[model samples]
Target: MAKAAAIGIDLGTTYSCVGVFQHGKVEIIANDQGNRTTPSYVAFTDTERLIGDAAKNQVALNPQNTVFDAKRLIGRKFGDPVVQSDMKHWPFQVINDGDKPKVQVSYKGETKAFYPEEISSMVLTKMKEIAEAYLGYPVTNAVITVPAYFNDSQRQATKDAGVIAGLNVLRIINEPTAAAIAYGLDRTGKGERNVLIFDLGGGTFDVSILTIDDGIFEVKATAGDTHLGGEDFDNRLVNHFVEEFKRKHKKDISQNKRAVRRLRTACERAKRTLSSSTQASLEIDSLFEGIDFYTSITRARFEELCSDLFRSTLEPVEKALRDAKLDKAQIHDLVLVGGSTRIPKVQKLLQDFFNGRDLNKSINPDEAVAYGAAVQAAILIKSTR
Candidate 1:
């Protein structure tokens, strides 16, 4: 008989990943799409609801009903300054429900409303499904990660999402704190040391400093921009190309949501490509009204375009160290977490911030949090026995 298992989840702003500890190892579970991580996206349609890659693939076609990047809004009030500002940029409609923001969409013929946690629950359910299929048994009890700086409200909202997905929440650790375990696993010693975790994912940035003595970990300070990350960098490229296309075709596609979504998709792909290449090109056919858009950018150019945002990422790193009352040299290890850290500029600046020290590269930026969370989950399972 297959053994039941508790899993760990990294419920990210832009993507979600699930992992489990078994055979004395942490293994990430792939979804039906054969991807270790799934897009944290959900779409409500007339026939049904789509999630993960299915929902992500149709963003341009169903921008209004397809939702992505709701982590920033989870637990935030409708009139919150940041929520109000972020809503302006989202393609979907989020109406006020008693002071909380409720996402309204047409599902199966009738309009339905969902709290941010409910939409998040769909993504969690998708992750849960992936884990159960991989483990070959029903899975329950999960340790989920939130940004290190999340308040009690945000933390509780995240756990509620997991509960709604039918998993008993074992713990809600900070994203950076979870990454610290994954980072420390590569170390050969158990000496007491301070480590800094820099997490820059698809939609948010988080930095934290932790004191790890042997196997115990204590977070000293946390800081970051909830609105800053890979998407913001992609938008920098999107806005630049939008102006160029306007100048070339004399058509302002900025107001056209579909055109912007297409451009954003292309720009995001090109941005990822820039991380591995000296130059990346973006070409979109029929961008608008019989016009095509083609462009190429150097890694340096992409860095130049997002220089401010890239520089801004380090502010929280500095703040974390200051708040933790630790010196730069005192931080023995610097760990990079999140996909955005792949950018050459982000790494260079992070390295430069620590006076040319190398960032820990042992952990997979995308899967590290889940791996650590799974370790947490496994430890709890063992303790209960």
Candidate 2:
């Protein structure tokens, strides 16, 4: 029965990926739209709901109906500081469902509510569907990856999502470890090396040190902030544009859901563009209250605003190294993982901290965790066989 199709999932805060271990290699299963990474967004409509790329496309247009960043709220109480802070930026409503937090959105012309796990399940189900389609068989089991710093409750919430999606989550692995394993498999020249993995994804940042020897990969130590990552960087630019618009037009568009959503899209574009270019512009017409907003941001200024945030990531790196009881000089390889690592500033920061050492980007950051998950899945299945 094709061994019941063992799959691996990287259920990232900003994007998600699914892959399978087959044909002596890890194969990333692309979504119906033929994309490896799908935006972790869900949108509710009158007749149906949309997930991934389709849901992401509607964020600016249907802010109230769209939900993203559920990872931040999952497995936490409504009164958690992070959840309280998110309510300021998230257009959709997050309410106290007595013991846990719940997301409220307009669906089918009625006010509907969903648990964080329920929302996450939609994304997981979509991934399972994609994998099933690619493998030409039902994928009933998977190994999912999560940030290393996630607490027990958060990890349990993730498992709940998998259960709701109708998949037996055979294992829940740390993201940095997965990245290390994926990188370890490709290493031939390096022997008995101590590797440092810096993973900065959409909503979390983690640094892990691993000892790799032959085919064995062991995680020595890990540290990170669950509240930091690409989303935080995006919010810095987002708030900047919002303040700029308010300064010029004397209108507070912060409470205007549609305007803020549109600004988010533009700011994300500017952030990605500025990573490569020295400058980028934010231009949106009739953004709110019939006011046009236009501004150019230099990378220097971008770095300046987010410099503290960038520097905060380094503490975890230092902590991880300390926990591993190893000096930076003892590290044999440094690897970068996750989409946020694409920023030139992030790259420069790591290089400077590593004494001008070059980073290992051999694996695609977006797909590395999924790839490693597949490898682990394969290992588990082989052991059972």
Candidate 3:
């Protein structure tokens, strides 16, 4: 990343990453903290505003002022049913500014209101600074990736955020499309190959079937579940553990919103823990009424409770193949994107669905979109330069 030429960014929900293309490849730039990806968080305090790791570090103490999911609120109206419903889940205050929702924060010893774009712009600005510091050059033009289902309004809001970050924003590409471009970058073989990209995101799930293997990357079909995402998996575990606590300690913590919120965070980690190991543990001190609770779950039992979602994840795969009018046998390569795809159960189900075909693990799943955007940025930078 130090000697890179053109800049690109992955504007994701949970995290954001910046990369550059140089010397015939893409290098994902690391921040001063040695982190490849920056958390998509912005926090406000009486003294100063914070971004990325700094904002995330004290989230527990300042949850109400920390804006974590700007992508979800960007360009959405306050009256939107989903938007209104989503507000209930977040700790940060969302107030109506006319028809749009605005976040309220305490900054500089005063009450401040910011629209979602303004909040998101700060994250992109941090991204710009990260790239500049790593490459030792100013970056103006870059390509950013978003989810496949963003509407015109949402896309425009993202571009507005980019503009606020002082970026030219050469293009706003879809996440799966960028991933397909990344997949195309490595191949030396000839002929069009049917490729399936499964991006199970934190807020949404989408599967894309594309025909790639050459200079042209064409998407045949895309399908997914909007409401079904990592949050669902998290809640499934959270509720399961709540019941487990009821049975083990003879107490129900579900009625406690604050405690349930804390449990959610722990459940999220336990979910990631199960991905790397056969079993995961859940232990909390004074979880409810001065009672400490501890438990472990085997991979088998974890999948058993989450099997419904594991199987439903492939429903989009089936629909995408059918919409493309291609058989499962025709799918040449399976590309995994998004963090949820890293789950072993997800991989096993997808692999079994594809008849034991190996997943294309050539690219880094987490940083692949940034790499793809960097590739696209280089392709554009040459013409613009």
Instruction: Please give each candidate's TM-score.
Output: 0.91, 0.83, 0.87
Residues 1-385, candidate 2: write the lDDT tens digits: 6564688999888899998988788888889898999988999998889999999887777889899888878778888887888889888998888868999999989999999999999999999999989988897788988877678999999999999999888899988778877876436555777888888888878788888777566778888887788878888988887787777877788898888878888888999899789999888998887777778999998898799998888999999999999999999888888888888888999999999998988677889999999988888866766
- How do the residues 116-152 of candidate 3 rate in per-residue lDDT, one tens digit apiece? 9999999999999998987777877889888766889
Q: For every candidate structure, what is the RMSD over all alpha carbons to the true structure, in angstroms?
A: 2.4, 3.6, 3.0
How much does candidate 2 score in TM-score?
Answer: 0.83
> Among all windows of ten consecutive residues in candidate 3, which has the lowest summed lDDT?
1-10
Stretches of model 2 off by over 4 angstroms after superposition = 61-65, 76-98, 185-193, 212-219, 238-260, 277-301
Q: What is the total number of backbone clashes in candidate 2?
A: 0
Candidate 2 lDDT score at position 251 = 79
Full ranking by TM-score? 1, 3, 2
- How does residue 308 of candidate 3 score in lDDT? 92
Model 1's lDDT to the true fold?
0.86
Stretches of candidate 1 above 4 Å error?
A: 1-4, 76-85, 96-98, 185-191, 246-252
